[PDB]
Structure 1
Amino acid sequence: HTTPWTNPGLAENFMNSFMQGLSSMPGFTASQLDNMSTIAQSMVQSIQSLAAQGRTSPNKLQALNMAFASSMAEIAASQEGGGSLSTKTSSIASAMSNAFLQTTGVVNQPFINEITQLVSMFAQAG
């Protein structure tokens, strides 16, 4: 239970840290950041409720972390406004990288790469 994918407290820390970091990065409108913040806070509260019920597990926490990251990639790709897709992509990657450093102290680069591929995948579908 040493990572966001196995420890509910660390999953919550990860998502809060991602947002704190993203808030100082370029490419996003106030509206986009509000939307991302609203979503992060709803997913943090949702992991808190499940943890209270003993209803988190590695499999569910993995899927919830992926849900969080996919929804961020989706806002970036679909929501009109702000800077370039490439600026938004770099900003989400830097925010993810700091969220790892703030939690496990170990960046999961393949996961960051995967989220970067999501942004392009979603942008191209829309």
Structure 2
Amino acid sequence: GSHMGQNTPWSSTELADAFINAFMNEAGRTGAFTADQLDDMSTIGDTIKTAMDKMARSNKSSKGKLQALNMAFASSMAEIAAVEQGGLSVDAKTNAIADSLNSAFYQTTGAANPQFVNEIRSLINMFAQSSANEVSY
């Protein structure tokens, strides 16, 4: 049963804005991220929109830009989540982020997208590990 269609939050600037906005709202509900942490995340909102504008104007990576956007966004979350902090864990925050993403999809459209969430989750892990293995004791 092929989808025969495509649905991505980066399809339009309006969608991305709504997704980011809704995402922040859900993140606030979790309380996993602090006020300062939220500010850093909200920053990616304007950065993404700006990048999309310039990227859209260009005639290169018409499709590759999709992966770049997902990686760039995920990278910001991975870096922010991968912080020392106190009484908190990156794993716990990672789970909370995934939950917020699902809610954002519904508010932005109204359909859960666990597949997309997993894709972002994987990117975060890659960025966190810096594309490198470890003892993992």
Is the structural similarity TM-score above 0.5? Answer: yes
From the superposition, tell whether residues 41 and 22 of structure 1 become closer, same or farther in structure 2 (CA, over 3 Å): farther
Conserved? CA contact 2:19–2:105, under 8 Å: yes
Structure 1 alignment gaps of length 5 or more: none
Structure 1 counterpart SS, 2:129: helix
The residue correspondences of 1:34-49 to structure 2 (distance < 5 A) are: 34-47=39-52, 49=53
RMSD: 2.9
CA distance in 1, matches of 2:114, 2:120: 10
2:115 maps to which residue?
110
The higher relative CO (CA closer than 8 Å, separation ≥ 6) is in 1
Aligned-residue identity in percent: 50
The residue correspondences of 1:1-126 to structure 2 (distance < 5 A) are: 3-47=8-52, 49-50=53-54, 55=57, 59=63, 60=65, 63-77=68-82, 79-82=83-86, 83-125=88-130
From the superposition, tell whether residues 11 and 97 of structure 1 become closer, same or farther in structure 2 (CA, over 3 Å): same
Per-residue deviation at 1:73? Answer: 2.2
Structure 2 counterpart SS, 1:31: helix
Structure 2 alignment gaps of length 5 or more: 1-5, 133-137
Which protein is richer in helix relative to its size? 1
Larger-Rg structure: 2
Per-residue deviation at 1:116? Answer: 1.8
